[PDB]
């Protein structure tokens, strides 16, 4: 069990640091998260096992104590990963910028001339958007995209 790029799981930006840890903490206390393994820059940080002579209330405080300083001073290319076990779940926190494009208004040809997207990711996304993940958030149908890099000029 190891976390690596291009794998099934959740991805959070540093802007959503405060929210991600809250859900991990509240999950830890309310008997919903059993074990957490933190990874700084792909290296093991420490293991939080509620059954390792520890407790849920201690584990909640311990989790924030370890990662509050790391995640508040993130650098370009620095990332923190979690192996969340509920009985399984994978998370990566990174310091990218978040930009939302409301189409009911940046066109696609300006988006492509700037960022380089993976064809195999867009291929599957197009197919599952018309026939053979996409979320419905407050009357809209949002889709998240992660470019591989910036376009040459």
């Amino acid at each position: 069990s190891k976390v690596e790029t291009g794998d099934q799981g959740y991805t959070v930006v540093q802007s959503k640091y405060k929210k991600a840890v809250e859900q991990l903490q509240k999950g830890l206390l309310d008997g919903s998260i059993t074990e957490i393994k933190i990874f700084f820059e792909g290296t093991l940080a420490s293991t939080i096992k509620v059954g390792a002579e520890l407790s849920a209330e201690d584990a909640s405080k311990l989790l924030f104590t370890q990662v509050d300083n790391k995640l508040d001073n993130l650098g370009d290319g620095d990332y923190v990963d979690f192996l969340i076990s509920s009985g399984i779940t994978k998370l990566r926190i990174l310091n990218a910028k978040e930009e939302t494009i409301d189409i009911d208004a940046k066109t696609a040809q300006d988006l492509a001339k700037k960022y380089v997207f993976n064809k195999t990711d867009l291929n599957t996304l197009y197919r599952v958007l018309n026939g053979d993940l996409v979320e419905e958030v407050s009357g809209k149908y949002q889709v998240v995209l992660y470019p591989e890099g910036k376009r040459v000029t």
Binding site: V13, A96, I103, K119, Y126, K140, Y141, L145, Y146
Partner: protein, 405 residues
């Protein structure tokens, strides 16, 4: 949920739309432009010499994807700058010989070229130059002078000159080096643009059945004859070959066609139009040229663009060097002849998809548009290459619409 991203992904994007359909129109637009800005390439230089050099550095002995060879080459086919008359048929020659076709000046061997010769052959200051590397000189003394021949020989390279007393005899000397293993092509020399439209087809390493075999396969040679009758030599060269004559009556007369009828005993197929562009269109839409040469179950996904002889027929030499590239395209081969991406169902012959060269400088004809639309696969274009400068943006715009890139 269900996908974690790269450590260095610059921005996280979220596409918000009231309706899923409007999102499909935005993802499709994104999918097309993203694959239409990275897959559409341009290889050019200020003069025709560096254009052929850049075309060599990218597709021969280059570590990038979508190249022909990823390792050293053992042969190089050299042609003069203003040598369109004698060297037009060198495209199938460079193809079977597995060599990059390079353009040199008539009297002086350019330092740019001599560096490219040493570079592409992995020739370096610590390696001695022996006769293990050959440089095929295609043309007479007005194509490549004796000054250039003796320089290449002074280094120690094995120099083979394919020349004759006339342009027609020169082409026969070239087509004799290209293994006629029973088909051929004939052009008149009055229309050189029609001959360039057939260069990518003739340079394909094809099998006996018409499919493609890059191992133990041969390319089909081209011959230039006067358009009169058939002379004593070309008739000897054409024994039982299926001639695919190219050009109108003004290029090769019906007398020349009838003489081939009497010579080889087979009916010669004729591809011609009123314009040099129309001849190109009919070559692209020929099933037995591109579509039926594919071992895979796809259609033509790769395309090339070059200038024609409207402004100056000399400019067409750009499409000549690109023919050996467009013939073997879609696969990258190492020293052993195995396909790679950086190293390495996925057989070479099954992965080859040649690309037709479209001739257009100022505008793209309606016939060329219809022909190119016929050969395209359902999944649409995957690679487009613009060789040379001076091609109008109108043409490239129309191509990107036809290929959906």
């Amino acid at each position: 949920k269900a996908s974690i991203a790269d450590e260095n992904s610059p921005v996280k994007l979220t596409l918000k739309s009231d309706k899923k359909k409007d999102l499909k129109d935005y993802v499709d637009d994104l999918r097309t432009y993203n694959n239409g800005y990275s897959n559409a390439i341009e290889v050019a230089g200020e003069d025709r010499i560096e254009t052929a050099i850049a075309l060599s550095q990218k597709y021969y002995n280059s570590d990038d994807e979508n190249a022909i060879f990823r390792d050293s080459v053992d042969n190089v086919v050299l042609v003069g700058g203003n040598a369109i008359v004698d060297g037009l048929v060198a495209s199938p020659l460079a193809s079977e010989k597995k060599a990059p076709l390079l353009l040199t000046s008539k009297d002086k061997l350019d330092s740019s070229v001599k560096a490219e010769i040493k570079r592409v052959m992995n020739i370096k200051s610590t390696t001695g130059i022996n006769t293990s590397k050959k440089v095929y000189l295609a043309g007479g003394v007005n194509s490549i002078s004796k000054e250039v021949e003796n320089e290449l020989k002074d280094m120690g390279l094995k120099v083979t000159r394919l020349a004759g007393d006339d342009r027609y005899e020169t082409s026969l000397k070239i087509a004799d080096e290209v293994g006629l293993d029973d088909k051929a092509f004939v052009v008149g020399g009055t229309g050189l643009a029609d001959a360039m439209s057939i260069a990518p087809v003739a340079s394909q390493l094809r099998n006996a059945n018409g499919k493609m075999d890059l191992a133990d396969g041969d390319a089909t040679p081209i011959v230039v004859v006067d358009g009169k009758t058939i002379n004593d030599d070309v008739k000897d060269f054409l024994d039982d070959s299926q001639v695919d004559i190219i050009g109108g009556e003004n290029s090769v007369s019906k007398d020349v066609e009838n003489a081939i009828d009497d010579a080889t005993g087979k009916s010669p197929d004729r591809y011609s139009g009123d314009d040099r562009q129309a001849t190109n269109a009919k070559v692209i839409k020929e099933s037995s040229y591109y579509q039926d040469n594919l071992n895979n179950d796809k259609k033509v996904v790769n395309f090339f663009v070059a200038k024609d002889g409207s402004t100056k027929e000399d400019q067409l030499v750009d499409a000549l060097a690109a023919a050996p590239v467009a013939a073997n395209f879609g696969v990258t081969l190492n020293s052993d002849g195995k396909p790679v991406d950086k190293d390495g169902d996925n057989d070479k012959n099954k992965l080859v998809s040649p690309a037709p060269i479209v001739l257009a400088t100022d505008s793209l004809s309606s016939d060329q548009s219809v022909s190119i639309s016929k050969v395209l696969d359902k999944d649409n274009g995957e690679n487009l290459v613009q060789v040379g400068k001076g091609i109008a943006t109108s043409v490239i715009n129309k191509l990107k619409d036809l290929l959906s890139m």
